[PDB]
Structure formats: C-alpha cells, structure tokens
Amino acid sequence: GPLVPESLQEQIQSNFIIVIHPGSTTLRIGRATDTLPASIPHVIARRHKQQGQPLYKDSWLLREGLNKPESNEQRQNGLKMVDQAIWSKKMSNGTRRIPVSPEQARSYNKQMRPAILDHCSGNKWTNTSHHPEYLVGEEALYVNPLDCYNIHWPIRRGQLNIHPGPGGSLTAVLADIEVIWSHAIQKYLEIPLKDLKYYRCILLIPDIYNKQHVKELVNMILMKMGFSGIVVHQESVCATYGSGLSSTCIVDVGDQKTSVCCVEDGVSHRNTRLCLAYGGSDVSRCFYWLMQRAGFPYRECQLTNKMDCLLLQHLKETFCHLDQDISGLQDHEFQIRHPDSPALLYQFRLGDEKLQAPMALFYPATFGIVGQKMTTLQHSLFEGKALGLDKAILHSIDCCSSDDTKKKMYSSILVVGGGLMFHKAQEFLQHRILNKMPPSFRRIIENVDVITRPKDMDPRLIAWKGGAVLACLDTTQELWIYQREWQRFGVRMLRERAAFVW
Ligand SMILES: Nc1ncnc2c1ncn2[C@@H]1O[C@H](COP(=O)(O)OP(=O)(O)OP(=O)(O)O)[C@@H](O)[C@H]1O
Ligand SMILES: [Cl-]
Ligand SMILES: [Mg+2]
C-alpha cells in the first residue's frame, strides 16, 4: 500500500528486478515494476557464414507424426468425437444445433476472388543489406525466406529445442537464448548489458522442468549475462500469485504445451502435475485443415511458411469460438498484407469449422499426431495417447490425496495463457467439468468455478505478473541465489534454496 511518487519510482527495489517468462512462441520480459511486460517472438535468425548452405527452418505449426499411415484415420475419428460432443449439447433455446456442410461452403467459396485494398501491402521484409549476423524477434520473423538465414526457435513444446543439425545442440540453444534475452533487455527495457550487475532476476520455469536445463539457464543468467542474483520459480505457482488464488487447479494453455496441476499455497503437488504436448498452434493447424475442406480461398498457403503461419494463427483468433449458439454458415472476410504482395481482402463463408477446431483441445486425437509422447507426468500407453483438456484437469485433481484439497480444486479451476482465449471458453469448459466430474463431489460442492480473466487481466500475462508479485514477497528475501554462491557451489544452491522441491 505504499504509493510511490513518480520522481522516485525508478529507485524502488522492484525497479532492479527483471522478471523473465520464456515461452515456445513468446518471451515475456520486464522490470517487476512494469505494468505490462514486453512481449517478444521468442525466435532468432542467424546468418550463414558461407554461400550455398542449406536453409534451416524450425518447425512451428508442423511437427513430427502428422503424416503416419494412421494419421488420417485418427484425425477422422477424432473429428467424429468432436461432432458427437457438439450435437450432444443442446442450444440455449433447448434445440439441437443444425450442422452445416463443408461442401455447401466450398461451392460458394471457390467462386470468391480477393479484392485489393492497396497496391502495396504496407509490410516489408526485414532489411539485411548490412548483413547482420543475426536478427531477433519480430525482425527475425520478417526475414525473406530466400535470404541466407537459418530460423531458430530455442523453445518448442515448452522445452529446450534440441535437435539434429545447426542450432540444435544444447550449447547452440543456450547461446540463442542469451542473444534473444540480452537483445530484449537492451532494446525494450533499455538497460545496458554492462549494468546487469545492479539487477536481480526472477526466472519462471515450467511446472514439470528439466533440472539440467534449468541449471544451465541459471548459469547463463548469473555467469554469462551478469545478474547478481536470481530466483527461480514454477510458472504454475506464479500464476496463482498473479491471480490471487492461493489454492486452485491451474491450466496453462500455451501455443505448444498445456500444463495442468493443483496448487495449494505456493505448492504445486507433484502427483497432480500433467504436461500435454499440444496447444494453440495445433488448433491453428487443425482450423487450417478444416478451412481447406471448406474451400479456403487463399490457395497457396503453406504451413512451412512463417507469414502464412502468422495468418493462420490470426484467423483462428478471429473466427474460432466455443459458443454452441453461434451456428450456421456465416459470411466473413479477412485481409492478407504480406511483404511482396498487395493488401488483399478475402470474402468467405464459414460454418462449424469455427467451433470444431477449438474443441480438438478436448478431443486431441483430432490432431492426427501418431507415434509421439503426448502426455507427461512428473518423475507407456498413457503417454502415447493424447488426453483431452477436461479429462486431464479431472485426472489431475483426482491425484490429490486429501478430499478437502479436491473440494478446493474442483471448486476453483484457473485457466491461463493464450491457448484457450476463445469466446465462451470459460462457460464451455465449466459445463464439461460439471457433467464429467465425480457426481459425489458435484453434490458436496456449492459450485464449480472456472476463472479465465481474473481481475479481468490478460490470461497471457497472469504468470508473469505473479513473478513480479513474487519479488515483493517477504519470504522471497531468502530465495535469492547470488553469483558467488553459484560460482562456488553451483547446483547445490538450487537443491538447498529452491522454493519448490528441486
Ligand atoms: N484471442 C485469442 N484467441 C485464441 N487464441 C489466442 C488468442 N490470443 C492468443 N492466442 C493463442 O495463444 C497461443 C500463445 O499463448 P502463449 O503466448 O501463452 O504461449 P507460449 O507461452 O508462447 O507457449 P507455450 O506456453 O506452449 O510454451 C497462440 O497459439 C495464440 O494463437
Ligand atoms: Cl493484463
Ligand atoms: Mg507459456
């Protein structure tokens, strides 16, 4: 409650604490005093050192296992489960939702031609005339695909993006992280790197984390970048802080990973931890596939193409919904303003695809991913099969030992991150939870409450905000690990001094 005059707010403690929340697609970074953190595409373009090197592009909306022999059938059967769930749920007036045909749409759609809004789109490729060794964030996304740059996303599906080839070693990934993080600090926080010695860092990490990798990051923060101290915490607990819910089931739907777990007073219960290998991006790809069947008028779209991918993400965020009551064929329009093209405006007609795609989050077989580990527990048949979001929430809560805990968890489900930012998502999910949960508890419990915009904030920023909040906490004074303790004892510090059980 200490209100600080503007003449002094650059001198309070939290002005010298940098809060860092990495993501597969977006880095969120800022001073603990910033109201909004900077949001950067967590990506880097690196120049070739020679002529005639093959262009490496990281996968984004594509991933392994989409084209196995079984992929197409699995996709089909999932979409039938989605459809069954859609039909099964009556509309507000109590009637059935009348399905509309993809073919009916296709007929109208591929008579559609784009109009031009402008001769030039108004966007251009990042300029690389001066041969930068690298580019970061949005500048990286806008590198002409024909330029001699490899594109690297240091994080995929919420873990370090290690893979065969250039940029895929642990060391390359760490160097890319450092370059990306350092660039953001100088450019957006406007903090010279030589000054980091006066700063401390709060690093948010996944609920289920990799000890070795966290170790490395901490080493990077303290030793390579020059922060004097650091505090590491799980993004799930931070989410609870940012939202003000001491006890709650937390679900973080990101672009590529979905976390579920139960948190009780700053503690994520290991036995309740689940990580699912899908998120917003999978929905984006699915929506694309559905739209193609409806005669999607942009016919030269490709999933391997960054600009197209931004378009698909955007289309999903504009059209997709989880509202039973929005039905029928609707007339829509969208723009394309890519570099090297005109500003284009497209008419087209969409039906159930707008609802089917987001619901694949509850029927993830729809993604048609075959032969991959899809589910992860904290230190198998259950892993290779993808688990719907609601089943995961339930399963997680069911892994609480106490029943008073469970009462608390069913009663409060917090949903965080961007992945589930669809219209009516809160209601939609609250409805499934009621019907799907154990009926014994459904009675004992006054209501199931799903929270999506707590305090009416941006779900993408809740955890980051919690990180800042964590810096103000009294118990936090004892969490800091400082450079010299690290240089000396290293990993021993985390075992001794981590807020969570290392
Ligand atoms: N209004 C919206 N409607 C639907 N989806 C949205 C909306 N806004 C953002 N998203 C989605 O949120 C996802 C990104 O969420 P977020 O930035 O929390 O992920 P991340 O932290 O980068 O990824 P991860 O947590 O998987 O590592 C993207 O798939 C994006 O399309
Ligand atoms: Cl906000
Ligand atoms: Mg995330």
Residue numbers in the entry: 32 to 410, 502 to 624
Could you share sentences copied from the article?
A notable, poorly understood feature of several large multi-subunit chromatin modifying or remodeling complexes is the presence of nuclear actin-related proteins (Arps) (1) along with nuclear actin (2). INO80 contains actin along with Arp4, Arp5 and Arp8. Actin, Arp4 and Arp8 together with the helicase-SANT-associated (HSA) domain of the Ino80 ATPase form a stable sub-module of INO80 (9), while Arp5 together with INO80 subunits Ies2 and Ies6 associate with the AAA+ ATPase subunits Rvb1/Tip49 and Rvb2/Tip48 (10). Deleting Arp8 in Saccharomyces cerevisiae results in an INO80 complex that also lacks Arp4 and actin, in addition to the losses of DNA binding and ATPase activities.
To provide a first structural framework for Arp8 we determined the crystal structure of Homo sapiens Arp8 (a truncated variant that lacks the first 33 N-terminal amino acids), and studied the solution structure of truncated and full-length human Arp8 (hArp8) by small angle X-ray scattering (SAXS). The crystals contained one Arp8 molecule per asymmetric unit. Except for 91 amino acids (R411–I501) in a loop insertion, we obtained interpretable electron density for the entire protein. Additional density in the nucleotide-binding cleft could be interpreted as a bound ATP molecule with one coordinated metal ion. Despite the relatively low sequence homology to actin, human Arp8 displays the typical actin fold with a central nucleotide-binding cleft between sub-domains 1 and 2 on one side and sub-domains 3 and 4 on the other side. The most notable feature of Arp8 is a long insertion I (K80–H162), which emanates from the ‘DNaseI binding loop’ (D-loop) on sub-domain 2, binds across both halves of the actin fold to wrap around sub-domain 4 and reaches back to the D-loop.
